[PDB]
Design an enzyme around this catalytic site. Structure first.
Site, PDB file in Angstrom:
ATOM      1  N   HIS A   1     -29.658  64.798  34.383  1.00 25.51           N
ATOM      2  CA  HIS A   1     -29.616  63.918  35.533  1.00 25.51           C
ATOM      3  C   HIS A   1     -29.052  62.530  35.203  1.00 25.51           C
ATOM      4  O   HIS A   1     -28.770  61.757  36.126  1.00 25.51           O
ATOM      5  CB  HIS A   1     -30.970  63.844  36.251  1.00 25.51           C
ATOM      6  CG  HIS A   1     -31.998  62.979  35.583  1.00 25.51           C
ATOM      7  ND1 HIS A   1     -33.045  63.550  34.884  1.00 25.51           N
ATOM      8  CD2 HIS A   1     -32.194  61.655  35.548  1.00 25.51           C
ATOM      9  CE1 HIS A   1     -33.825  62.579  34.417  1.00 25.51           C
ATOM     10  NE2 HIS A   1     -33.356  61.422  34.825  1.00 25.51           N
TER      11      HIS A   1
ATOM     12  N   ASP B   1     -32.850  70.505  32.515  1.00 29.33           N
ATOM     13  CA  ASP B   1     -32.431  69.112  32.619  1.00 29.33           C
ATOM     14  C   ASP B   1     -32.134  68.544  31.232  1.00 29.33           C
ATOM     15  O   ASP B   1     -32.897  67.730  30.707  1.00 29.33           O
ATOM     16  CB  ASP B   1     -33.470  68.274  33.345  1.00 29.33           C
ATOM     17  CG  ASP B   1     -33.041  66.853  33.644  1.00 29.33           C
ATOM     18  OD1 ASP B   1     -31.822  66.570  33.487  1.00 29.33           O
ATOM     19  OD2 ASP B   1     -33.902  66.048  34.029  1.00 29.33           O
TER      20      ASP B   1
ATOM     21  N   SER C   1     -35.926  58.422  31.103  1.00 28.77           N
ATOM     22  CA  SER C   1     -35.189  59.676  31.150  1.00 28.77           C
ATOM     23  C   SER C   1     -34.413  59.920  29.858  1.00 28.77           C
ATOM     24  O   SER C   1     -33.692  59.035  29.387  1.00 28.77           O
ATOM     25  CB  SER C   1     -34.234  59.661  32.334  1.00 28.77           C
ATOM     26  OG  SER C   1     -34.923  59.636  33.575  1.00 28.77           O
TER      27      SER C   1
HETATM   28  O1  LIG Z   1     -34.529  56.357  36.955  1.00 31.19           O
HETATM   29  C1  LIG Z   1     -34.732  57.433  36.459  1.00 31.19           C
HETATM   30  O2  LIG Z   1     -34.984  57.590  35.175  1.00 31.19           O
HETATM   31  C2  LIG Z   1     -34.510  58.715  37.139  1.00 31.19           C
HETATM   32  C3  LIG Z   1     -33.458  59.055  37.942  1.00 31.19           C
HETATM   33  C4  LIG Z   1     -33.627  60.433  38.320  1.00 31.19           C
HETATM   34  C5  LIG Z   1     -32.900  61.330  39.108  1.00 31.19           C
HETATM   35  C6  LIG Z   1     -33.324  62.640  39.238  1.00 31.19           C
HETATM   36  C7  LIG Z   1     -34.483  63.074  38.595  1.00 31.19           C
HETATM   37  C8  LIG Z   1     -35.222  62.206  37.808  1.00 31.19           C
HETATM   38  C9  LIG Z   1     -34.793  60.892  37.685  1.00 31.19           C
HETATM   39  N1  LIG Z   1     -35.314  59.832  36.934  1.00 31.19           N
HETATM   40  C10 LIG Z   1     -36.578  59.889  36.225  1.00 31.19           C
HETATM   41  C11 LIG Z   1     -37.768  59.645  37.131  1.00 31.19           C
HETATM   42  C12 LIG Z   1     -37.602  59.450  38.484  1.00 31.19           C
HETATM   43  C13 LIG Z   1     -38.683  59.213  39.323  1.00 31.19           C
HETATM   44  C14 LIG Z   1     -39.952  59.203  38.826  1.00 31.19           C
HETATM   45  C15 LIG Z   1     -40.188  59.431  37.452  1.00 31.19           C
HETATM   46  C16 LIG Z   1     -41.490  59.442  36.902  1.00 31.19           C
HETATM   47  C17 LIG Z   1     -41.687  59.663  35.573  1.00 31.19           C
HETATM   48  C18 LIG Z   1     -40.595  59.867  34.762  1.00 31.19           C
HETATM   49  F1  LIG Z   1     -40.810  60.100  33.441  1.00 31.19           F
HETATM   50  C19 LIG Z   1     -39.320  59.859  35.208  1.00 31.19           C
HETATM   51  C20 LIG Z   1     -39.077  59.647  36.588  1.00 31.19           C
END
Ligand SMILES: O=C(O)c1cc2ccccc2n1Cc1cccc2ccc(F)cc12
Ligand SMILES: [Zn+2]
Length: 226
Positions: A45, A89, A182
């Site tokens: 992602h 992912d 991420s």
């Molecule tokens: O900004 C980001 O890193 C991001 C972009 C994005 C796009 C698609 C999927 C995931 C995604 N993340 C991680 C993430 C997004 C939302 C909540 C989260 C909670 C915990 C966590 F470890 C990771 C999170």
């Protein structure tokens, strides 16, 4: 990283800070880790139009001699990556050149074994991500010790699957990976077992990590052939 501590500077020399460019919005950021001198592993992602990797960083706002700012020549997303379920992912980044090995920059290797990790134990994750829901990304590398959970703790993520993913972070605590973390590695007794993937927008743990073990054949394939 929510509820963590500042890392000892340069104590995790494989950590990579990713700046990801898209055509139609400002930069986004992820973590990742150096697995060969010219390859970084991160989350799929985090793909974009182009990516720049900074190795050797602690405080990402202050340039220093340990920094290596490295061009990415190609992005290799897992061929089974699904944008709906977020299964598979995982992504490899090939660097234009090989990084320099220094005290502050080196690879994290896998053991020959490709073992499945069951729940129960404490693991550590590091990143420059947000320190809370309404908080900017950390200037300094942060890290946190988290509990591997039984898979039922992640049931509310309806597309979570135990064989593909790890369920990480005791829901009784605020400690968690979060946005901006991420692609960062989860280390259990010093071995990379997973990758930060996703979680709740409100930051309540657990969060979902990609289980590296499934992908070792894939990872080997890309490394051998590129
Ligand atoms: O900004 C980001 O890193 C991001 C972009 C994005 C796009 C698609 C999927 C995931 C995604 N993340 C991680 C993430 C997004 C939302 C909540 C989260 C909670 C915990 C966590 F470890 C990771 C999170
Ligand atoms: Zn330094």
């Amino acid at each position: 990283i929510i509820g963590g501590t500042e890392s000892k500077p340069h104590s995790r020399p494989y950590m990579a800070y990713l700046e990801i460019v898209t055509s139609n919005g400002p930069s986004k950021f992820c973590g990742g880790f150096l697995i060969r001198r010219n390859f970084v592993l991160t989350a799929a992602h985090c793909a974009g139009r182009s990516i720049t990797v900074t190795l050797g960083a602690h405080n990402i706002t202050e340039e220093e001699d340990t920094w290596q700012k490295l061009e990415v020549i190609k992005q290799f997303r897992h061929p089974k990556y699904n944008t709906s379920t977020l299964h598979h992912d995982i992504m490899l980044l090939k660097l234009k050149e090989k990084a320099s090995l220094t005290l502050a920059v080196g690879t994290l290797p896998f053991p020959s074994q490709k073992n499945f990790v069951p729940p129960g134990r404490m693991c550590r994750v590091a990143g420059w991500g947000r320190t809370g829901v309404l908080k900017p990304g950390s200037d300094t590398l942060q890290e946190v010790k988290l509990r591997l959970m039984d898979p039922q703790a992640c049931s509310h993520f309806r597309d979570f699957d135990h064989n593909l993913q790890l369920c990480v972070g005791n829901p009784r605590k605020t400690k968690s990976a979060f946005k901006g973390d991420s692609g960062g590695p989860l280390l259990c007794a010093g071995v990379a077992q997973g990758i930060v993937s996703y979680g709740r927008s409100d930051a309540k743990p657990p969060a979902v990590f990609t289980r590296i073990s499934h992908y070792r054949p894939w990872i080997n394939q890309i490394l051998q052939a590129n």
